[PDB]
């Protein structure tokens, strides 16, 4: 069960250096011993090996320069979880400290002087070209511009922000997964030996999907740190890149002044479910390393990330005890909705890409939609959409392009609820769409009601006093080999009850919360084209979204900010539950 991982993109691979990741509860003594064991064993087989660095703090492991001939030997070592081959990364009031993992910085620029501390940490790969020389260049450009966008006196977002620079990218704007890893461990170690102040980390870089890079980011995110990353500048799915694909980091895509996704020559901003929101990223004025008072116009998803890192720094200077779930939820809440022209993205990626452009703010119920990865085409294939640890799964829906679905289930998986969608017989696959919320003093629970083919017992609701229905899931409970007959809808008596087929099990989210009040909204169209919509009003927050009828006329349904969207084929009704606190 000790696995080897390498970058999917061959030209970004760096064979010869490997991150050996050990099992969770491994002390520094065991990491050193395991690295020494590998050195000795390699020496016995006649190979020189260099232990570049030993990881302690963020995750247990070590960095080793060795021939790939010795991999098979290293996989057999004791305590090894996995070995990942190194690969390259590329450049793309209270006191809040903002860490920046990027190039060098011109710290004496008027735009950022006195607000930027150069940490002395430096870990970069050597430049390509036998005769490459920086000459008059100080390799400050990218980092200086970004430090300016985050906190520059005149052109910055958070003009009251302390910054800390780590050099993780060389003159050519190239870094490695291993150098970033060391940079993150430096930050964790700083945080351990330094304050209980709010930390923001800006990762304006991207590489191919990396298991260890995402693991280290998750561990920093769970330690309280707020990670903001660039989505990537490859006009591709950001789930194929790291730290972009890490679910805990805030992944920012780029938009221009005409609310269009940014184009960078033949490529452009990355997209998909792993992007959290978009931010201004084309023709961005910021500090230039050319002179101490110069400005320059740069474009890309690092520019976009730096706006969000600035916004996060301002929100944190006001509310320093704010958690990462609260911060992410607040970011999504204050952004401009439906402004971006989705035409530029691939058609199958549009649904999955948020239509959100960051903005500053000008107790409360916050929700956000979380799409799963597509399931396999197997008939018993499932998609799983998970919320962040501090959030509540308030509803769960599913969507298939073919429309062949068994429905979905809100079930516990490791003590937390997840939204698990199920593919049907003959179906291509499905997505699970969770609705993750931050509800003040919630005691929420899901209750499963069985299929109701009898004349009574059909109404499913939160029968408990003080508990209110926030969302319904429906899962088709007829075996695939069974005689298929057209589904029958459960009659409608009360307004606040789950809508569903008599042949389906119903999962009902019931919340008991101090000022929580929750209502239902419907909207039907007889013969619609493409879709049906019903939206909550100002003040109300969408918590559930369901379609009516089933597979026959529907592809699925999903939340789009505070709009419930049902996708039809060529009496479709969108049922929404709107919810609010105090």
């Amino acid at each position, epitope marked *: 069960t000790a696995t080897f991982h390498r970058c999917a993109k061959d030209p970004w691979r760096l064979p010869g250096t490997y991150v050996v990741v050990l099992k969770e509860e491994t002390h520094l003594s065991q990491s050193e011993r395991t690295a020494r064991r590998l050195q000795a064993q390699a020496a016995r087989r006649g190979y020189l090996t260099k232990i570049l660095h030993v990881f302690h703090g963020l995750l247990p492991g070590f960095l080793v320069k060795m021939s790939g001939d010795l991999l098979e030997l290293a996989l057999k070592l004791p305590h090894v979880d996995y070995i990942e081959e190194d690969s390259s990364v590329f450049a793309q009031g209270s006191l809040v400290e903002v860490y920046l993992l990027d190039t060098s910085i011109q710290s004496d620029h008027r735009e950022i002087e006195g607000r930027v501390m150069v940490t002395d940490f430096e870990n970069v790969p050597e430049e390509d070209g036998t005769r490459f020389h920086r000459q008059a260049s100080k390799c400050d450009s990218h980092g200086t511009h970004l430090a300016g966008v985050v906190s520059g006196r005149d052109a910055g977002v958070a003009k009251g922000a302390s910054m800390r620079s780590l050099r993780v990218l060389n003159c050519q704007g190239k870094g490695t997964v291993s150098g970033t890893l060391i940079g993150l461990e430096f930050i964790r170690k700083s945080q351990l030996v330094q304050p209980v102040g709010p930390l923001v980390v800006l990762l304006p870089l991207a590489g191919g999907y990396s298991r260890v890079l995402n693991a280290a980011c998750q561990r920093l995110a769970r330690a309280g740190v707020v990670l903001v990353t660039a989505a990537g500048n490859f006009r591709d799915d950001a789930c194929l890149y790291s730290p972009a694909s890490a679910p805990e980091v805030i992944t920012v895509g780029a938009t221009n002044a005409q609310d269009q996704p940014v184009t960078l020559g033949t490529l452009g901003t990355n997209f998909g479910r792993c992007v959290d929101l978009f931010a201004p990223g084309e023709d961005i004025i910021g500090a230039s390393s050319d002179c101490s008072t110069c400005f320059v116009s740069q474009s890309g998803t690092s520019q976009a990330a730096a706006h969000v890192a600035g916004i996060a720094a301002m929100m944190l200077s006001a509310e320093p005890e704010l958690t990462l779930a609260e911060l992410r939820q607040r970011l999504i809440h204050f952004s401009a909705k439906d402004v971006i022209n989705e035409a530029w993205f691939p058609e199958d990626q549009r649904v999955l890409t948020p239509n959100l452009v960051a903005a500053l703010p000008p107790w409360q119920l916050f929700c956000r939609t979380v799409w799963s990865a597509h399931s396999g085409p197997t008939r018993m294939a499932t998609a799983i959409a998970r919320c962040a640890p501090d959030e509540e799964l308030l509803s769960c829906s599913s969507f298939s392009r073919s429309g062949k679905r068994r429905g979905e289930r809100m079930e516990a998986q490791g003590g937390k609820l997840v939204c698990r969608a199920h593919n049907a017989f003959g179906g291509e696959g499905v997505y699970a769409i969770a609705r993750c919320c931050l509800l003040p003093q919630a*005691n929420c*629970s*899901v*209750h*499963t*009601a*069985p*299929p*109701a*083919e*009898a*004349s*009574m*017992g*059909t*109404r*499913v*609701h939160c*029968h*408990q*006093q003080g*508990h209110v229905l926030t969302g319904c899931s429906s899962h088709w*409970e*007829v*075996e695939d080999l*069974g005689t298929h007959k057209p589904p029958v809808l459960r*009659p409608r*008596g009360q307004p606040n009850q789950c809508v569903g087929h008599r*042949e389906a*099990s*119903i999962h009902a989210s*019931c919340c*008991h919360a101090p000022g929580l009040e929750c209502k239902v909204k419907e909207h039907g169209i007889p013969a619609p084209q493409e879709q049906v919509t019903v939206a909550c009003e100002e003040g109300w927050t969408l918590t559930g979204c369901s379609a009516l009828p089933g597979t026959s006329h529907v592809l699925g349904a999903y939340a789009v900010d505070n709009t419930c969207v049902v996708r039809s084929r060529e009496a479709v009704t969108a049922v929404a539950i709107c919810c609010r606190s105090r």
Partner: antibody
Amino acid sequence: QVQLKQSGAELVRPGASVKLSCKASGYIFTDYYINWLKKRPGQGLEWIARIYPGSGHTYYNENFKDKATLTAEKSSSNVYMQLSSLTSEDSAVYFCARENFYGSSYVDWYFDVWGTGTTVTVSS
Amino acid sequence: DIVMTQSQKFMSTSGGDRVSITCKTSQNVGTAVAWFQQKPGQSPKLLIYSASNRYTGVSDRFTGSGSGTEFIFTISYAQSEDLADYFCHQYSSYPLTFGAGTKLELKR
């Protein structure tokens, strides 16, 4: 006269299968759900599964999805439960019971009539 | 899965006139709790439904109270004819879950 008559006790070899029956009378068979429940000596009842005999559609406890298989026979007016690949943990007393609804709510019902149970012993 | 945690033994009150057992659920089941009587070698007998309503023909000596996560079943002027096991059950969420049962003991 509303009643559920269950089949006699059973002895079966580990890895074999049993087919328990629960015969209904005194009411419209197809109109009520029939549940199956496991009673082990020390433990409290475990709900196995339900079946609407009018349509034959079943709903199981995920823990018995593989072991159990419900079926109904309208002519005979009885419900069956077949347990497969039996082990000594399946040696228990099995009860069938009827759900009686009195309202539209999914919580407006009760187990009004039961069978007396069928002891299943799994032994070599 | 909702967890039913029933009393180990009947606790007495009012000099043996009232005897009771408590049943606690892991989550709020509202009032979806029924109580059964079970004499050995006999089919369970529904007594209380919906936490406090008596099924038809059930003696007025049997009572149920409570809501949410604590429910109490009580027998007044308990007789030898009432010696049996008593169990609760929740029906707020599938899988339906039950209490272990509590045998009634009487002094004499």
